[PDB]
Write a protein that binds this ligand. Sequence first.
Ligand SMILES: *[C@@H]1O[C@H](CO)[C@@H](O[C@@H]2O[C@H](CO)[C@@H](O[C@@H]3O[C@H](CO)[C@@H](O)[C@H](O)[C@H]3NC(C)=O)[C@H](O)[C@H]2NC(C)=O)[C@H](O)[C@H]1NC(C)=O
Ligand SMILES: *[C@@H]1O[C@H](CO)[C@@H](O[C@@H]2O[C@H](CO)[C@@H](O[C@@H]3O[C@H](CO)[C@@H](O)[C@H](O)[C@H]3NC(C)=O)[C@H](O)[C@H]2NC(C)=O)[C@H](O)[C@H]1NC(C)=O
Ligand SMILES: *[C@@H]1O[C@H](CO)[C@@H](O[C@@H]2O[C@H](CO)[C@@H](O)[C@H](O)[C@H]2NC(C)=O)[C@H](O)[C@H]1NC(C)=O
Ligand SMILES: *[C@@H]1O[C@H](CO)[C@@H](O[C@@H]2O[C@H](CO)[C@@H](O)[C@H](O)[C@H]2NC(C)=O)[C@H](O)[C@H]1NC(C)=O
Ligand SMILES: *[C@@H]1O[C@H](CO)[C@@H](O[C@@H]2O[C@H](CO)[C@@H](O)[C@H](O)[C@H]2NC(C)=O)[C@H](O)[C@H]1NC(C)=O
Ligand SMILES: *[C@@H]1O[C@H](CO)[C@@H](O[C@@H]2O[C@H](CO)[C@@H](O)[C@H](O)[C@H]2NC(C)=O)[C@H](O)[C@H]1NC(C)=O
Ligand SMILES: *[C@@H]1O[C@H](CO)[C@@H](O[C@@H]2O[C@H](CO)[C@@H](O)[C@H](O)[C@H]2NC(C)=O)[C@H](O)[C@H]1NC(C)=O
Ligand SMILES: *[C@@H]1O[C@H](CO)[C@@H](O[C@@H]2O[C@H](CO)[C@@H](O)[C@H](O)[C@H]2NC(C)=O)[C@H](O)[C@H]1NC(C)=O
Ligand SMILES: *[C@@H]1O[C@H](CO)[C@@H](O)[C@H](O)[C@H]1NC(C)=O
Ligand SMILES: [Zn+2]
Length: 900
Amino acid sequence: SKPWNRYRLPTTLLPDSYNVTLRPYLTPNADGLYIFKGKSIVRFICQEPTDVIIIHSKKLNYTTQGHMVVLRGVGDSQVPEIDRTELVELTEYLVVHLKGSLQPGHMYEMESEFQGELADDLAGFYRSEYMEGNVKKVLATTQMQSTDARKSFPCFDEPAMKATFNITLIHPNNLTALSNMPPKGSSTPLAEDPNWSVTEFETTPVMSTYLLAYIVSEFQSVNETAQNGVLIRIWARPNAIAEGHGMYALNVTGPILNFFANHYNTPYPLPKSDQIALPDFNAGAMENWGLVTYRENALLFDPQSSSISNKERVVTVIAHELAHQWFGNLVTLAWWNDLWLNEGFASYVEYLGADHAEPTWNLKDLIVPGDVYRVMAVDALASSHPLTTPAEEVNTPAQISEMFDSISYSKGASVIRMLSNFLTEDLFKEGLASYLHAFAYQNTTYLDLWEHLQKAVDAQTSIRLPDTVRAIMDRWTLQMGFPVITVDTKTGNISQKHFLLDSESNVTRSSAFDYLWIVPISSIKNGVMQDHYWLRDVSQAQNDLFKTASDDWVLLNINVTGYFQVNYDEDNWRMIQHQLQTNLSVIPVINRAQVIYDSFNLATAHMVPVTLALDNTLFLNGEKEYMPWQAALSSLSYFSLMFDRSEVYGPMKKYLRKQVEPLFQHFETLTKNWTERPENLMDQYSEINAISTACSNGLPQCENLAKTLFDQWMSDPENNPIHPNLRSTIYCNAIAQGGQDQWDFAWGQLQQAQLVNEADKLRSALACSNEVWLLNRYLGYTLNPDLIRKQDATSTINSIASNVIGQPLAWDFVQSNWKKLFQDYGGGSFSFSNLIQGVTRRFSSEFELQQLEQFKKNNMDVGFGSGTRALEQALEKTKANIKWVKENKEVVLNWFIEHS
Ligand SMILES: *[C@@H]1O[C@H](CO)[C@@H](O[C@@H]2O[C@H](CO)[C@@H](O[C@@H]3O[C@H](CO)[C@@H](O)[C@H](O)[C@H]3NC(C)=O)[C@H](O)[C@H]2NC(C)=O)[C@H](O)[C@H]1NC(C)=O
Ligand SMILES: *[C@@H]1O[C@H](CO)[C@@H](O[C@@H]2O[C@H](CO)[C@@H](O[C@@H]3O[C@H](CO)[C@@H](O)[C@H](O)[C@H]3NC(C)=O)[C@H](O)[C@H]2NC(C)=O)[C@H](O)[C@H]1NC(C)=O
Ligand SMILES: *[C@@H]1O[C@H](CO)[C@@H](O[C@@H]2O[C@H](CO)[C@@H](O)[C@H](O)[C@H]2NC(C)=O)[C@H](O)[C@H]1NC(C)=O
Ligand SMILES: *[C@@H]1O[C@H](CO)[C@@H](O[C@@H]2O[C@H](CO)[C@@H](O)[C@H](O)[C@H]2NC(C)=O)[C@H](O)[C@H]1NC(C)=O
Ligand SMILES: *[C@@H]1O[C@H](CO)[C@@H](O[C@@H]2O[C@H](CO)[C@@H](O)[C@H](O)[C@H]2NC(C)=O)[C@H](O)[C@H]1NC(C)=O
Ligand SMILES: *[C@@H]1O[C@H](CO)[C@@H](O[C@@H]2O[C@H](CO)[C@@H](O)[C@H](O)[C@H]2NC(C)=O)[C@H](O)[C@H]1NC(C)=O
Ligand SMILES: *[C@@H]1O[C@H](CO)[C@@H](O[C@@H]2O[C@H](CO)[C@@H](O)[C@H](O)[C@H]2NC(C)=O)[C@H](O)[C@H]1NC(C)=O
Ligand SMILES: *[C@@H]1O[C@H](CO)[C@@H](O[C@@H]2O[C@H](CO)[C@@H](O)[C@H](O)[C@H]2NC(C)=O)[C@H](O)[C@H]1NC(C)=O
Ligand SMILES: *[C@@H]1O[C@H](CO)[C@@H](O)[C@H](O)[C@H]1NC(C)=O
Ligand SMILES: [Zn+2]
C-alpha cells in the first residue's frame, strides 16, 4: 500500500516550527454559515529522501494560488517542483507529489491559504454561542484534543512530532485574543481593514499540536502575580467576573502550581497561566498548555449558593489540569496507546495538589471511593481490557477515542497510587523528577518511566522488591482485572484468583500470566502494623503474618493502597466485626469502609453469604466518619432499587433509621441546632449524608427539621436560611411532606434562578412530590423549551422516575411519547441511552420484563436513536435482576427484620 493510505504519518519529514494565522468570522454570511480563514507556514526537516510530503488536513478548503501549497527551501536551499496535490479524506491527509526528491539535512517551508466552517461542533476551531442579557454572543475557541488540530490548519498532527508555534489571531477590534503564550505586544490594526485587529503571540516552547489553543471573546479576568513573576489569570464572562465567581479559582491556582513545582522538582515551564471558563464546554476540561479550558460551571464558584462538594469539585478539577502542565505537556507520551499513564497520573495527583491547597481538609483519601471502588465495579467483569494496548492496534481516530475511558483514568490512577506507595513517595518523586529532567520537551513510553523508577530503587537499600519495577507493573498493566486475596487465619494460608462479580462468567481474553499477580500486602494485627509482605505469582502461599490466635485478628490492605479486594475466613470476619462494634478507632477509617465495600462485592460473587455483608454495616450506629457511611450507602443503593416497592423496604428503612439516629443527634449537638457547619470537609460530608439518610428513611426529627427550614424560607423568599450543603435533602423532603403550596413556590424559584447549581437542586427537588397530579404535570413541562431546557429534559424525567410513585408515571410517559425520536434525534441527540437506562433501572420481575419486550415491539419506525442496545442492556439487566431478587429477597428480609 501507498504511504497516504496508512493512518500513521511517515517519519521522513519532521516539523521544526509553524507560523499559523487564523481569522474567525463571528458574523455569518447571511446564508447561515460562519467560517474561519487561515494562512500557515510550516518549516520541517528532511530525514531520509522522499518525493512525497504527507501532512494532516481535515475539512479545509484551500484557496492557494495554483497548487494547494507553495513550497520553498530555507536559506540557499532549492526545492523540487510540485507534480500535484491531492486530498485523501479517509486518512485525513494533504498529499504533495513532487517531480523529484527532498534531501536529508535540508529545511523546507510549506505555505498554505485555506478556510473551513467555524461550526458549533466542539472540534478544531469552533464557535460557542451564549446569552448576555438580550444579546446573542459568539466566541471562537479550540478543542484540538485527539486529532483535531488538523481541522484548523494543516499540520503534522501526531503527539511526538513536536514544534514551536507562532500564532497570530486576526479578530474584531473590540474583542480580546488569547493563545498558549503571552501576546507579543499590542494589537495593531489590519492594514486592509481597520475594523479588524491583529494580535501576535510569543513563540511557544517545543510542544505537541493537540495542546494548542486560541480564543477570540469578550471575556475578562481576575489576575494575581506570584513572587516568582508568573502571571496567573481566570477568564470568564464579563457578568460572571463581576459577581466574584472567579475568586476561588484564582486563590487555589497559585498554591497548586507551587505544590507541583516542588513535587515534580521542576518549575512551571511557562511565563503565565490563563484558565478560561467557557459556556457549554462539554468535554469538561482540556489541559492546553498555558490556556486551560473548563466548562464554565466547573471553574466558577459562588460561595453564597454552592456546597462544599462544588468547592471540592473546583479545586480538584483545577489540580488535574495543572498537573498536566508538566506530566503530559512538558513530557509527552509518544502515542495514544499510553494515554492511561498521562490521564492516570493526573487523575491521582489531582488529590495531592488539592489537599495542599485546602490544607486542613484531607482530600487525599477521596480517591478510594471516587476512583478505586468505582473502576473496580467495571474491571471485575469479563468485558474489561488491560491498560496497555499494543501501539500498532491504535491507528484510526475512532480507535484513538476508545482510549479515553474509565480504565484509562481510574485504574491508571489506582495502580500508580499503588506503585507510589510500595516504593514510597520519596522514592517515587526521585525517579519522577529524573524522568522529567531527562525527557523535557520530548516523547516517552511508560517503559521510560519504569526505567527511571528502577534507577532510583537501584540507587538505595532500604526498600526491596520481589522483582524489577517492570516485572511487577507488567502484571497490573498487560492483563485485565485484579485479584481477590483470600486469607485463612487458622493456618495463615493465603491465595489469589482473578476476581469477577459474576461467578458463572467466561473470561475469553487470555493473559500471558494466567491471571496471577505480584501483590503488595500491608497488614495490621490487633491494631498494630506488621512487616510488609509480597505475594508472588502463585495461587497459594503460606506465611505466619496471617496466622491468628483464638482471640487475635488480622486485616489486609491498609488504606486500600493495593488494587485488590480481601476475603478472610468467617472467624476473622467476626473478630473484625466485634472490634469495630467495641472500639472502631483501632482500625483506620479507609479500612472500615473497605470491609463494607469488599464484602458486598464478595457477596455478589457468591464468596461470602450476603448476610455477612449486612453484618459489616452493624457497627455504623457508632460511626462518625464520612467514608464508612458512604460505603454502606453505595453498596445498599442497588438493594433499595430492587426492594423499595416490596415488603422489604419497611424493615430496611427501620434499620437505617436505627443506625443513623445517633449520628443525627451528634450533628444536632455539634452544629448547635443546624446553625453552623462542621470544621473540615470530611465532617461536612458525613453531615450531608446523615441528613440525607435520615430524611429518606423517614426519621421524624429530620422530617421536622426540613418542614421548619422550608417554611422559614417561604415566609421570607429573599433570605434563604438553608445552608447550600443541605439544600438538596431539605428541598426534597419538604416538597414531599407538602403539596402544591411548596411545589409552586420552588417552581417560581427555578424559573427565576440565575445559577445552574441552584436550578439543578430545584429540578431534582420538584420530582420528590407524593401528589401523582403534580408529577404528571411536571412530566408535561419537560418537553416545553421555555420551562425546561432541552438538555435538562431527560435528566428531569429520570429524577421523577427515581421517585417510586414516579416510576410508573415516567414509564408511561416515555413509552407513549417515545415516538419523539423524530423531533429530538433531529431535534438534537437527546441522550436516549440515559433515559431508558434510568426509567427501567428498577425492573425486577417477569411481568416487567414482558412490558419491555412489549414496548420493544414497536420496532417498526422509531428505532431507538443512539440508545439502541441500551434497550438490550435493559433486557439483559432485567433478567439479571429477576434472578438476583429470587436468590436474595428471602434472606435479606429476614436479616432486616432480625436487626431492626
Ligand atoms: C513567520 O512569522 C514571523 C513573524 O511575523 C516572520 O518573521 C518576521 O519577518 C519579518 C520579515 O518577513 C521581519 O520584519 C521586518 O521586515 C522588513 C521587511 O519590510 C525588514 O526590512 C526588517 O528587517 C524587519 N524589521 C526590523 C525592525 O528589523 C521580522 O524581523 C521577523 N520577526 C521575527 C523573527 O520575530 C517569519 O519570516 C515568518 N516565517 C516565514 C517562514 O515566512
Ligand atoms: C468548502 O467547499 C465545500 C465544497 O466545495 C462547500 O460546500 C458547497 O458550497 C456550495 C456553494 O457555496 C453549495 O452549493 C449550492 O449553492 C447554492 C447557491 O446559493 C445554494 O442555494 C444551494 O443550497 C447549494 N446546493 C446544495 C445542494 O445544497 C453546497 O452547499 C456545497 N456543495 C458541495 C458539493 O458540497 C463549502 O461552502 C466550503 N466551505 C468553506 C467554509 O469554505
Ligand atoms: C517563529 O518565531 C521564532 C522566534 O521569534 C523564529 O525563530 C528564529 O528562526 C530564525 C530563522 O530560522 C533563526 O535565524 C533565529 O535564530 C530564530 N530566533 C529565535 C529567537 O529563536 C521561528 O523561525 C519562527 N517560526 C517560523 C515557522 O518561521
Ligand atoms: C463590540 O463591538 C460590536 C460592534 O458593533 C458591538 O456589537 C453590538 O453590541 C450592541 C450592544 O451590546 C448591540 O445592541 C448590537 O446589536 C451589536 N451588534 C452586532 C452586529 O452584534 C459589541 O457589543 C461590542 N462589545 C464589546 C464588549 O466591546
Ligand atoms: C479568595 O480570596 C479573597 C481575598 O484574598 C477572599 O475575599 C474576602 O472576602 C471579603 C468579603 O467581605 C473581602 O472584603 C476581602 O477582600 C477578603 N478576605 C477575607 C479574609 O475575608 C475570597 O473570599 C476568597 N474566596 C474563596 C472562595 O476562598
Ligand atoms: C522523541 O523523543 C526522543 C527522546 O525520547 C528523541 O530522541 C532524542 O533526540 C535527541 C536529539 O534528537 C538526541 O540527543 C537523543 O539521542 C535522542 N534520543 C533517543 C534517540 O532516544 C526523538 O527525536 C523524539 N521523537 C520525535 C519524533 O521528535
Ligand atoms: C494450607 O496449605 C497446604 C497446601 O500446600 C494444605 O495442606 C495440604 O493438604 C493436602 C490435602 O489434600 C495434603 O495432600 C497435603 O499433604 C497437605 N500438606 C500439609 C498439611 O503440609 C492445607 O490444607 C492448607 N489449608 C487450607 C486450604 O485451609
Ligand atoms: C492511613 O491513612 C491515614 C489518613 O487516612 C494516615 O494518618 C495520618 O498520618 C499522618 C502522618 O503519617 C499524620 O500527620 C496524621 O495525623 C494522620 N491523619 C489522620 C487523619 O489520622 C495513616 O498514616 C495511614 N497509614 C498508613 C500505614 O499509610
Ligand atoms: C480505644 O483504643 C485506643 C487506641 O489503642 C485508645 O486511645 C482509646 O482511648 C480506646 N477507647 C476506649 C473507649 O476504650
Ligand atoms: Zn487530564
